[model samples]
Target: EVKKIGITQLVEHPALDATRTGFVKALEKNGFKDGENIDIDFQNAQNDMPTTQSIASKFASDKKDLIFAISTPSAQAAFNATKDIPILITAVSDPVAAGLVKTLEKPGTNVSGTSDFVSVDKGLELLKIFAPKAKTIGVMYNTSEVNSKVQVDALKEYASKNGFKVVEKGITTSNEVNQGISSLVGKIDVLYVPTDNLVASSMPIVSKIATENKIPVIAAESGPVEKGALACQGINYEKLGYKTGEMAVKILNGESVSDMPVATSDDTDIIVNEDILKALGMEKPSNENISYVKTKQ
Candidate 1:
């Protein structure tokens, strides 16, 4: 039987697209070549929340052997639409907080996969090194997203303990982004963006404003770095997606989802944008931990 895996993504963006690409390559390497042993029914939500939910229902109704959701909302929708169908998730920041799993070690249900939680602690540490005098940090995110909210909350907790004042701006749509970010100017020393789908999609606008003001932006993922964020302590999403594919192979081979622990992104690569650094009149520190990119490398 040719197994079918219905894959759903929240939107079209560099990082999410790269993750899908990596998943395909890894699955083929693992012997589940598409059009040979498997059928990939992939759907992009196209930035539509209703469409995302519908896609999940469609996948569940079609009874795919498994469902692979590439973002937090897509995964939550899949988990909501089906309880018996196996769901594998990637690129999500906090699966436990999203209620998609019981725990990272024991999902204890049909849902299990990878988490791309941005290392807020390490990110804060980098912020300190980047600007030791930075006493205030600003954050912008789509308040509607489960993962983004979780990360922001985590940031506040971390900031409180680290003696840094945190400023927050919540945007429901891109239309409000300019004002949201504008409202934060002069109130914060640095700006941080979480792995929010909406925020990643509008990163160019964020970059344009942040660059003009010389406010350094550090993103949770590389997609924003491609849009001009100064640097990022972000997960290599392609590698994380490949790991999810390997986990999918286990499920296809009759392994229980609960038996396999959720893969947490324990390792993160530092990505620094050369142009943004220069634009902001900043220089990259001589840290071996940092990898240089001329915007999107």
Candidate 2:
């Protein structure tokens, strides 16, 4: 009998899409080929809260052998839908704060997966190198996302300690993104885009506004940088998802989810956008660690 797996994703963006791609690839590599050894049902919520809940409920009713949630909202919905279904979550910043798990070392629940938690300190360090004279940093995040909040709070703490003033713009919807980022256009020296689903989906707008204003963007992951952000010490979502999928394979092999600790990628890539760099009239860094790529958006 083939194992049934339900994948719930919040929206269709490059980072989230890459994560799902990596996950399916890992499962296939582990001998759990989709359409052969496993039955995979994928659903996208399109960044809707109600849709995410509905998808999670449908997955629970379908009695899937396992469920893979791609974002924090999707994970929350899946966890609320079923406690025994063995849900694996990725792209989530802080599972403990999100209440998906009891602790990082021991989940103490049926939910366990990898985190796309990029270090804010590393990101700031990159900013220091690229914009050494920058004094004020701007940050935009979705107000409803706990994952974004976790990163923002940490960024605030770190920036305050380092004497960098952080200008914050919070938006609850994509419609507010234009105004939110516009408010910071001339006030900040740099913009930091965390791994927020809304911001990821609205990268073109964020990139356009920041680029027009000549403000450099430092993203939490490479997708935004690929879209047009200047640079970042970004997390590789595919590798992060592959790591999560390995955990899923262990669960499929009858390993206890409670005993599994949440995982995260150990690597961060120094990614920069060549087009954005040139467009913004910023000189390329002399760092040998940078992987520069042209814009996709």
Candidate 3:
């Protein structure tokens, strides 16, 4: 008997797409090959909440054996669409804070998956380590994303604990990033960017502004660091996706969804942009210490 699965992603960006590919690859490697014993139908919402909600309803109505959601928003949509189907999510910051699960150990629901909660205290610690003199951290995020809010709230608490003040700038759309970032110039010492889809997708604009202002950006993902963030302490999304696939295998083998615990990325790496460091007249950390650094252009 073939197992059919439906995957709904928050957006069609390269980072999320890579995660989907990695998930399917891992599934195939684990003997759940598409066209053999598995049929996976993937959809992208292009960052539209309504579209995601619609797709989630459609997938639930179609009666897929399982549903894999790529982000918190998508997962919430899937959870709302069905209570019986098992829903696994990836790249979500805080499942508990997002109300997807009642507890971390036992979710007590029909959904459980991987989270990128490394953005909370770890992100603040990275910022403090990289720029010790920096007293104010500016955070840019989409006000509409619940996951982003969860991360920001945690980041705020972490920042407060470590003696740094947070200046939050929330925007509703991608077009507002430029102005939101511009407003923080000279007011903030370092910029902290979350893995919010809208901001991540338009990272270049934020990077350019921060770079021009000599403000270092500490990102929540390596890809943003590659795009010119000063540094990041976050998990590789592809590897996280692979881990999610492993959980999917267990779920497929008759593991109860309520009994399955939400997993977190065991792997974490520090990525820095050498170009940004050089432009800021800073020295890069030794290769043995930093996981990866982007080459200067």
Best-fitting candidate, measured by TM-score? Answer: 2
| Model 3 TM-score relative to the real fold | 0.74
Best by lDDT: 2
- Tens digit per residue, CA lDDT, model 1, 1-297: 899999999999877987898888889998898999899999999999898899999998899998999999999999989999899999887788889999999999789999877667767677865666888999988888776887899899989999999999888888998888887888888888877888777777888888888788888777678778877887877888888999899888888997679987667788888898888887778777788887643
Model 3 ranges off by over 4 Å: 97-99, 127-129, 132-215, 222-228, 288-297
What overall lDDT goes with each candidate model? 0.85, 0.89, 0.85
Worst 10 residues of 3 by lDDT: 288-297
Q: Which pairs of residues have clashing backbones in candidate 3?
A: none
How far in Å is the alpha carbon of 239 misplaced in model 3? 1.3
Candidate 2 residue lDDT tens string, 1-297:
899999999999888998999899899889999888899999999999999999999999999999999999999999999999999999998899889999999999989999887787877887776678999989999889876898899999989998999899888988998888888888999888887889877888888999998888888778778788888887888888888889889999989998799988877789999998898887888878889999883
lDDT sort, best first:
2, 1, 3
Candidate 1: residue 52 lDDT (0-100): 87
Instruction: Point out the higher-scoring one by TM-score: 1 or 2.
Output: 2
lDDT of 2: 0.89
- Model 1 clashing residue pairs (backbone): none
Displacement of the residue 101 alpha carbon in candidate 1, Å:
2.5
- What does the lDDT read for residue 97 in candidate 3? 77
